[PDB]
Amino acid sequence: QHAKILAIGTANPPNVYHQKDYPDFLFRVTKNEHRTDLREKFDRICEKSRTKKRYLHLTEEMLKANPNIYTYGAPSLDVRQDICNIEVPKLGQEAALKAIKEWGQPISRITHLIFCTASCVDMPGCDFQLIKLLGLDPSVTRTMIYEAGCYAGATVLRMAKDFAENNKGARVLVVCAEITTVFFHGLTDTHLDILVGQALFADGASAVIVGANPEPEIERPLFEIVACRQTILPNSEHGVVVNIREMGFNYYLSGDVPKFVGGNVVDFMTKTFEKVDGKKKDWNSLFFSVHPGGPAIVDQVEEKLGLKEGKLRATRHVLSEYGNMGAPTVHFILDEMRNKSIEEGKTTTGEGLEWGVVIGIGPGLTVETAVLRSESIRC
Amino acid sequence: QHAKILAIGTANPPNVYHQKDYPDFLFRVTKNEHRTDLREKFDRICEKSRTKKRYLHLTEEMLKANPNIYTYGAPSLDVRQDICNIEVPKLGQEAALKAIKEWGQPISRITHLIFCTASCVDMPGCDFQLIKLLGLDPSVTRTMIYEAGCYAGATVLRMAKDFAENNKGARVLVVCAEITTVFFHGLTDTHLDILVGQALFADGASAVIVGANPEPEIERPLFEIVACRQTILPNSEHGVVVNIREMGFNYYLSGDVPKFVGGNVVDFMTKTFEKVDGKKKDWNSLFFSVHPGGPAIVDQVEEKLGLKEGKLRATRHVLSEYGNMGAPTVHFILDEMRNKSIEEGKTTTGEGLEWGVVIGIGPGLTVETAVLRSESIR
Ligand SMILES: CC(C)(COP(=O)(O)OP(=O)(O)OC[C@H]1O[C@@H](n2cnc3c(N)ncnc32)[C@H](O)[C@@H]1OP(=O)(O)O)[C@@H](O)C(=O)NCCC(=O)NCCNC(=O)CCCC(=O)c1ccccc1
Ligand SMILES: CC(C)(COP(=O)(O)OP(=O)(O)OC[C@H]1O[C@@H](n2cnc3c(N)ncnc32)[C@H](O)[C@@H]1OP(=O)(O)O)[C@@H](O)C(=O)NCCC(=O)NCCNC(=O)CCCC(=O)c1ccccc1
């Protein structure tokens, strides 16, 4: 009896930033309208981003009150943390309440909490703050995952699987929440990577309830977590770096990240499915939730696995409507897939297909995969 | 077939700071010899610390090169991280190689890595850096626990138990490493909590190998991880606070922490053992690894559980010889207990007793307990 996802909820900050307006906003509020050279480059990136809108906690009023946030390299960690240490658990709470509603059990049945964020760090942590906000049992068993990065949406499902399967009756609440205020930086041609993050990074939270042995007539599984694998892609340590600094969370992104993903995807898919059935080809038989770190990563997975037109629709839809929200994103994609499958009258939550995969990609470069089975559509 | 601890290794930085000498050192290198009132208070805290010596990576030359480290509130996180992000994995590597030696199996047999530190944070993390240093399989399954705090020496055993028990054949390397350079702060009469940390906090690393179903005549267990419980002590959110700031990792410690531990120990012990036995426990029948957050915390456990003289000897020995090294400390204590049990010709690794407990205590306040069984010395 494998661990099942029993519920998914999501949440975002209320302020919507349409991509068509974001270059004007960014260059105005950071006092960079004279940088027409960088504006040209940013326009090109935004046009390629395949991101139509994003939800962001950060406002112009926050930047006016804390101009060090947009002054490249100036001290600003403290103001960023004072925001994110509050907003990350709050956004997580909103998603968690939606997951708990779908699940339909009392909060007292939650035995385990996994909280994951790369947007802040504090002691006590976000897990403790969420317990307070939700009224979880003081004796919930907690795992607090700080600063793992963009593979962690798959990682938390792997962790929840082991906790749910080894602890009989356990019910694991998994919350991933991101507020990118800590990653916002000003513009300099010495650090062009910031233009990519300024185009793609976004705010959001997911909540997933995981448990083995669903209770008949109360609980309803959406997906089964079958097998997982984590691996480091060779010779790619420079791919994604984030340093926690006095200036905030400073990030460096190599232009070679998409090529590294495409050069390794057949291998990491083959080795993952070796844990299940030995699948080694015909990847279109699966459903997919691919972390959309950028559109070029999604395109590389599509090309090298030979995926047909539309196979990655749910992944692309989330990227378009929300951007790259970090770890929560693959859970938004699973929820979108479930929603569209209901809309289309499919026989399962995975686009009518039986088997699928979640692909998380982050620093290392590290890829974590989780093989899933879908479930029949009911309640 | 519960998960078992198959090996324990430990490491510390090379520089020894005897407590008798530390007040003179601290007040000299931080240019505070004029503060006679603070010196007198610090002397009193050190005399009560029950800590004889500590190992620290930080040196006077480092302070001279980076005086913002001892200038209270000055920006210094970047220099601290540049040190700790290197030194934490390096110290962890030393402890891990010792655990791997005892275990006796190839590094390629490790399937899972848990790395825990409250002393730094970076992406890729310490787990990635340790994989590089040791040559672990690039497909090891990793859990990177950053900034959990002083309960995590029990937490990592709980996590390792689940990973080892749910994955046939899995072998989990667990590494906890601390370098307190990030927590060093100068002296101000407005933040007296710093005098406590300056007296007690210290550097060290532990490594444990965990697996279920040890191979007969190849692997041998030291302890079995039976059951675990994590709980938040009521109305104690202000007990321990650590904020990651431009000035480093700033911390606040309530003087009520010992009383909170004492007020909850019967309850958390009772509820933990209810997971293993329907009969009530005689606390003196157990062996103990108690996180020595300070001597008063150890005293509160002894007092409220009615523990006999000598029951907490291993705990107090590690506090005396190493100070409070954070999450690794409870593993140093288990290693000391196993070593002393060999010296004394005891029948088990737990002082000749069958059942025992690891008590981790940290922010929340949060207590995590792990019920252990000992093993025969083999
Ligand atoms: C960029 C597009 C769309 C360009 O679209 P395309 O490539 O199709 O078009 P293109 O080739 O014309 O490029 C157009 C111009 O962008 C230039 N350019 C390209 N890449 C550049 C680079 N890396 N640095 C500098 N310039 C670059 C190039 O050089 C060209 O410049 P020019 O136009 O001047 O020639 C495409 O490449 C693409 O999706 N990429 C992959 C992006 C990637 O890795 N995401 C991983 C992100 N995860 C993290 O950050 C983790 C850390 C944050 C975190 O924890 C976190 C937490 C919470 C929430 C969120 C995040
Ligand atoms: C302090 C002793 C020994 C005093 O010994 P006793 O109590 O027996 O003697 P005592 O009563 O005479 O006190 C003598 C004078 O210390 C004064 N004093 C007392 N406590 C004070 C306080 N909190 N603030 C200000 N002043 C205080 C009092 O006010 C008196 O001042 P005066 O002498 O001027 O009157 C005793 O109490 C005791 O073990 N306590 C428990 C200490 C405690 O919580 N450890 C938890 C530590 N974990 C963390 O930090 C986690 C965060 C760091 C971290 O992640 C980390 C990572 C990696 C490695 C390491 C750490």
Short mmCIF file of C-alpha atoms in Angstrom, two decimals, chain A residues 95-318:
data_model
loop_
_atom_site.label_atom_id
_atom_site.label_comp_id
_atom_site.label_asym_id
_atom_site.label_seq_id
_atom_site.Cartn_x
_atom_site.Cartn_y
_atom_site.Cartn_z
CA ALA A 95 -2.76 26.77 0.53
CA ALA A 96 -2.88 24.37 3.48
CA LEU A 97 -6.45 25.32 4.38
CA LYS A 98 -7.52 24.54 0.80
CA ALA A 99 -5.77 21.16 0.86
CA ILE A 100 -7.30 20.35 4.26
CA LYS A 101 -10.78 21.22 2.94
CA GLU A 102 -10.42 18.88 -0.02
CA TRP A 103 -9.04 16.10 2.21
CA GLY A 104 -12.10 16.36 4.46
CA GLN A 105 -10.59 15.08 7.71
CA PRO A 106 -10.06 16.97 10.98
CA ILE A 107 -6.74 18.79 11.35
CA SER A 108 -6.17 16.61 14.41
CA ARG A 109 -5.49 13.69 12.03
CA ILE A 110 -2.36 15.40 10.64
CA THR A 111 0.64 13.60 12.19
CA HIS A 112 3.54 15.00 10.11
CA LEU A 113 4.41 18.36 8.56
CA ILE A 114 6.96 19.01 5.80
CA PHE A 115 7.51 22.73 5.16
CA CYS A 116 9.80 23.74 2.29
CA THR A 117 10.99 27.22 1.33
CA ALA A 118 14.01 28.78 -0.38
CA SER A 119 12.80 32.34 0.39
CA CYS A 120 13.73 32.80 4.06
CA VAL A 121 15.31 31.12 7.11
CA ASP A 122 14.65 31.59 10.85
CA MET A 123 14.64 29.71 14.15
CA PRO A 124 11.98 28.66 15.10
CA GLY A 125 11.16 28.00 11.47
CA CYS A 126 8.24 28.27 9.09
CA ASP A 127 7.06 24.83 10.22
CA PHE A 128 6.64 26.11 13.78
CA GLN A 129 4.86 29.25 12.55
CA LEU A 130 2.46 27.20 10.40
CA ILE A 131 1.64 24.94 13.35
CA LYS A 132 0.65 28.06 15.29
CA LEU A 133 -1.41 29.47 12.40
CA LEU A 134 -3.32 26.25 11.67
CA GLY A 135 -3.65 24.87 15.18
CA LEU A 136 -1.86 21.64 14.31
CA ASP A 137 -1.17 19.19 17.14
CA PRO A 138 1.89 20.39 19.10
CA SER A 139 3.34 16.91 18.66
CA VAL A 140 3.27 16.85 14.85
CA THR A 141 6.51 15.35 13.49
CA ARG A 142 8.24 18.03 11.42
CA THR A 143 10.71 18.27 8.55
CA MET A 144 11.73 21.85 7.70
CA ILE A 145 13.50 22.03 4.26
CA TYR A 146 15.25 25.39 3.87
CA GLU A 147 17.07 26.52 0.72
CA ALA A 148 17.00 23.28 -1.26
CA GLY A 149 15.92 24.85 -4.53
CA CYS A 150 13.96 23.94 -7.60
CA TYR A 151 14.12 20.16 -7.35
CA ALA A 152 12.38 20.16 -3.98
CA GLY A 153 8.81 19.86 -5.27
CA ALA A 154 9.71 16.26 -6.13
CA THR A 155 11.91 15.83 -3.03
CA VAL A 156 9.10 16.63 -0.59
CA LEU A 157 6.91 13.94 -2.22
CA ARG A 158 9.74 11.42 -1.77
CA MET A 159 10.13 12.38 1.91
CA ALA A 160 6.37 12.29 2.48
CA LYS A 161 6.23 8.85 0.87
CA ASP A 162 8.72 7.39 3.35
CA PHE A 163 7.08 9.06 6.37
CA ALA A 164 3.58 7.99 5.33
CA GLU A 165 4.56 4.39 4.52
CA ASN A 166 6.74 3.73 7.57
CA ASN A 167 4.36 5.33 10.11
CA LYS A 168 1.07 3.48 10.01
CA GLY A 169 -1.92 5.78 9.83
CA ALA A 170 0.27 8.83 9.31
CA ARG A 171 -1.10 11.79 7.41
CA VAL A 172 1.55 14.19 6.12
CA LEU A 173 0.82 17.81 5.32
CA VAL A 174 3.39 19.10 2.80
CA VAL A 175 3.62 22.87 2.29
CA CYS A 176 5.96 24.57 -0.18
CA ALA A 177 5.84 28.36 -0.17
CA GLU A 178 7.88 31.02 -1.94
CA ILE A 179 8.03 34.82 -1.70
CA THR A 180 10.68 36.12 -4.10
CA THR A 181 11.15 39.50 -2.38
CA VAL A 182 14.42 38.03 -1.06
CA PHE A 183 15.68 37.40 -4.62
CA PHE A 184 14.79 40.81 -6.14
CA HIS A 185 17.93 42.65 -7.29
CA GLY A 186 18.79 45.74 -9.27
CA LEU A 187 20.28 45.92 -12.71
CA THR A 188 23.94 45.81 -13.76
CA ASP A 189 25.64 44.53 -16.88
CA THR A 190 28.11 42.79 -14.55
CA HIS A 191 25.31 40.38 -13.44
CA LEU A 192 22.99 39.79 -16.39
CA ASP A 193 21.56 36.66 -14.78
CA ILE A 194 19.30 39.02 -12.80
CA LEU A 195 17.44 39.82 -16.02
CA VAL A 196 16.44 36.15 -16.31
CA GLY A 197 15.21 35.94 -12.71
CA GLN A 198 13.42 39.25 -13.08
CA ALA A 199 11.50 37.78 -16.03
CA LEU A 200 10.67 34.35 -14.62
CA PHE A 201 10.61 34.14 -10.81
CA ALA A 202 7.25 34.38 -9.04
CA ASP A 203 5.42 33.78 -5.75
CA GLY A 204 3.13 30.91 -4.77
CA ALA A 205 2.42 28.14 -2.30
CA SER A 206 1.23 24.57 -2.58
CA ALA A 207 -0.09 22.15 0.01
CA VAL A 208 -0.36 18.39 -0.46
CA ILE A 209 -1.79 15.80 1.95
CA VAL A 210 -0.04 12.42 1.71
CA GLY A 211 -1.09 9.14 3.31
CA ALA A 212 -1.15 5.40 2.75
CA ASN A 213 -4.35 3.36 3.22
CA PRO A 214 -7.07 5.91 2.36
CA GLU A 215 -10.15 5.78 4.58
CA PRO A 216 -13.10 4.62 2.45
CA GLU A 217 -15.79 7.23 1.82
CA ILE A 218 -13.80 10.04 3.51
CA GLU A 219 -10.51 10.11 1.62
CA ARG A 220 -10.02 10.00 -2.13
CA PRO A 221 -6.58 9.50 -3.72
CA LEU A 222 -5.45 11.65 -6.63
CA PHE A 223 -2.03 10.10 -7.34
CA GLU A 224 0.09 7.25 -5.99
CA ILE A 225 3.77 7.95 -5.21
CA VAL A 226 5.47 4.78 -6.50
CA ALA A 227 9.25 5.36 -6.71
CA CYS A 228 11.73 8.24 -6.60
CA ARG A 229 15.32 9.01 -7.54
CA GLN A 230 17.68 11.96 -6.94
CA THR A 231 20.84 12.51 -8.97
CA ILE A 232 23.53 15.06 -9.69
CA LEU A 233 24.14 15.84 -13.35
CA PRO A 234 27.88 15.58 -14.14
CA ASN A 235 30.06 18.67 -14.57
CA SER A 236 27.31 21.20 -13.81
CA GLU A 237 28.15 22.56 -10.36
CA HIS A 238 28.06 26.12 -11.79
CA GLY A 239 24.57 25.66 -13.20
CA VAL A 240 22.61 27.26 -10.35
CA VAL A 241 24.22 28.95 -7.33
CA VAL A 242 22.45 30.93 -4.60
CA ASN A 243 24.43 32.63 -1.84
CA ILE A 244 22.69 33.96 1.28
CA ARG A 245 24.38 37.36 1.65
CA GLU A 246 24.04 40.77 3.31
CA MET A 247 22.55 41.96 -0.02
CA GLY A 248 19.86 39.24 0.02
CA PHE A 249 19.75 35.89 -1.73
CA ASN A 250 22.12 36.40 -4.67
CA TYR A 251 21.78 33.96 -7.56
CA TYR A 252 23.85 32.96 -10.57
CA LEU A 253 22.36 30.96 -13.46
CA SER A 254 24.50 29.45 -16.20
CA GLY A 255 23.24 29.73 -19.76
CA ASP A 256 24.08 26.05 -20.13
CA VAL A 257 21.36 24.80 -17.72
CA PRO A 258 18.93 23.82 -20.53
CA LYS A 259 21.68 21.96 -22.41
CA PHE A 260 22.61 20.04 -19.23
CA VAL A 261 18.98 19.01 -18.72
CA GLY A 262 18.55 17.90 -22.31
CA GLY A 263 21.84 16.01 -22.31
CA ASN A 264 20.83 14.00 -19.24
CA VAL A 265 17.02 13.59 -19.45
CA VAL A 266 16.96 10.23 -21.24
CA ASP A 267 19.42 8.83 -18.72
CA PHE A 268 17.71 10.16 -15.59
CA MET A 269 14.31 9.01 -16.89
CA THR A 270 15.66 5.55 -17.74
CA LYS A 271 17.33 5.14 -14.34
CA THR A 272 14.16 6.27 -12.54
CA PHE A 273 11.96 3.76 -14.35
CA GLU A 274 14.51 1.02 -13.65
CA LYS A 275 13.05 1.14 -10.13
CA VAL A 276 9.59 0.31 -11.50
CA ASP A 277 9.38 -1.65 -14.78
CA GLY A 278 12.54 -0.93 -16.80
CA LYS A 279 10.88 1.52 -19.21
CA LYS A 280 13.47 2.89 -21.65
CA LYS A 281 11.55 4.45 -24.59
CA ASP A 282 8.05 5.56 -25.65
CA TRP A 283 7.94 8.38 -23.10
CA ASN A 284 4.69 9.67 -24.62
CA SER A 285 2.89 6.90 -22.73
CA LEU A 286 3.34 8.92 -19.50
CA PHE A 287 1.84 12.04 -18.01
CA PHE A 288 4.29 14.72 -16.88
CA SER A 289 4.78 17.47 -14.34
CA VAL A 290 8.07 19.14 -15.29
CA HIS A 291 9.44 21.94 -13.18
CA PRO A 292 9.45 24.92 -15.60
CA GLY A 293 12.64 26.55 -14.42
CA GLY A 294 12.44 28.36 -17.71
CA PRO A 295 10.80 27.63 -21.06
CA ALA A 296 14.08 26.36 -22.52
CA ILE A 297 14.21 23.61 -19.88
CA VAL A 298 10.68 22.50 -20.82
CA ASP A 299 11.61 22.54 -24.53
CA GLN A 300 14.70 20.37 -23.88
CA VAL A 301 12.69 17.73 -22.02
CA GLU A 302 10.12 17.70 -24.85
CA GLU A 303 12.75 17.40 -27.58
CA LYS A 304 15.04 14.79 -26.07
CA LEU A 305 12.22 12.51 -24.86
CA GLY A 306 10.45 12.84 -28.23
CA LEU A 307 7.25 14.13 -26.63
CA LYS A 308 4.36 14.88 -28.96
CA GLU A 309 2.61 18.21 -29.32
CA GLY A 310 0.51 19.00 -26.28
CA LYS A 311 2.07 16.43 -23.96
CA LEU A 312 3.47 19.20 -21.70
CA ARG A 313 0.33 21.38 -21.89
CA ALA A 314 -0.29 21.42 -18.13
CA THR A 315 3.35 22.36 -17.44
CA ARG A 316 3.26 25.17 -20.02
CA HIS A 317 -0.11 26.43 -18.76
CA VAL A 318 1.21 26.89 -15.23
#
